[model samples]
Target: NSFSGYLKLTDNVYIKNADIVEEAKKVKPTVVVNAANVYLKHGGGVAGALNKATNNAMQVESDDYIATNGPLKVGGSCVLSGHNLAKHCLHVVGPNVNKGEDIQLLKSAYENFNQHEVLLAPLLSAGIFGADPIHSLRVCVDTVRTNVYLAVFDKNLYDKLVSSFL
Candidate 1:
């Protein structure tokens, strides 16, 4: 109950700040949503971690997906498979904060989820992208439908999220 209390953001969404690979190993979510770029370069952040976790298979698939479908635009998404832990990986092109379109794109990504029982996502736009943590978390808390597990890495952002629920 305490764990639920600490993590629950909505009736169906939960938040945590742990190594996503380790967490994925433990929970085995049906889908893992990657806050990705248009180019599908898994160079750093959550994308990099996921690429490593899946033995670069995600990178290969992502590159092919981008080449086939064109670069993923803001709010656009594509799915990749072959992750040992998760059945599918949803790569969403998140907004660049400097472009002045942030929350809406993130909301669009959350809205795009077709249907999955267990969905795992990172705290979008809160990392190198430099979007406001509160706003990013708020979008995630408000838009998701399925059982969502959002992994947060930034301590300050994590604290802000926890305190908001309290």
Candidate 2:
């Protein structure tokens, strides 16, 4: 089925399989989390696609944020005005597992999300950041503090994480 419905992981935590950008178009959350690097460059990964969808506004805003505050550290996060996705875009720096950064940094990234309301994000722990895809699923479900939608782009990951959750 093309429209694989989202599931509830808790009273507030949610999970879905779809395009994070497209899904945001349907229902704008209070915030959308971008798996970002410390430099806040929107050139690649989920940030790249979000940069595209926002018509490069993401780059302008991220640049402005960095220029004002300087670089954010691994496990740190910042917020920006969302262009057509939501009211705000949250940029969180995650550990690059491929680079041998500690997996705990990935946990630190998720730990930073609770303050933002109605968050929508893909499996930020995985993807271009390089965290273990399956394992990150648990980290997301278990660590969230507010209502959230844990979007997974790949069907394989969707099914895999769902099975793993059970």
Candidate 3:
């Protein structure tokens, strides 16, 4: 679980607005990354939605990248819109419905990954999409290697991917 502190853990910047430029000025992190899920929001117009998406958290966007909520009402959960822009977005999914340990695992993974020079996450664990578990596992493993490291108690799943992938 340790990598000899490969990356430094510096101070954290918590932003509460939708102004990308303003937020960038405040954080000044070597790299800014968005960790919000699809359902996250604060309530307003597009600005409000952006606020909801990035408020009270680290937010980042490339100069021309802008996204609005779609008809799915999935907030930041769906990767269809904002995933490709802004260097990268870690698509992390949460535990299945109220399972505290699973949620904690994902959270811990998020925290650890953010410590490095990259961001990584699961798909839509915090949203309404009932993605196939196997497929979800594949996507998460492939995308998050640069940031987070995954662990699972399920021996079968773990064994299936560990040799070839992990």
Highest lDDT: give the candidate number: 2
Q: List the candidates' TM-scores in order.
A: 0.87, 0.92, 0.28
TM-score, cand. 3: 0.28
lDDT digits (tens) for residues 1-166 of candidate 2: 1224779777777788888989888877778899888898888778899899999998988898889899999998988888998899998888888878888877788988888767888787588777778777778777887877877888997888878774
Using lDDT, rank the candidates from best to worst: 2, 1, 3
lDDT by residue for model 3 (73-154), tens:
2222223223222333333324344333243344333343444564322232422333344454444443343443222324
lDDT of each: 0.75, 0.83, 0.33
Question: Each candidate: RMSD to true structure?
Answer: 2.7, 2.8, 12.8
| TM-score of model 2 (CA atoms) | 0.92
Q: Candidate 1 lDDT, tens digit per residue, 90-148? A: 88777878667655777886675646666777877767766877787777767777777
Output the worst ten-in-a-row residue range by lDDT, candidate 1: 1-10
Indicate the residue-level lDDT of 77 in model 1.
82
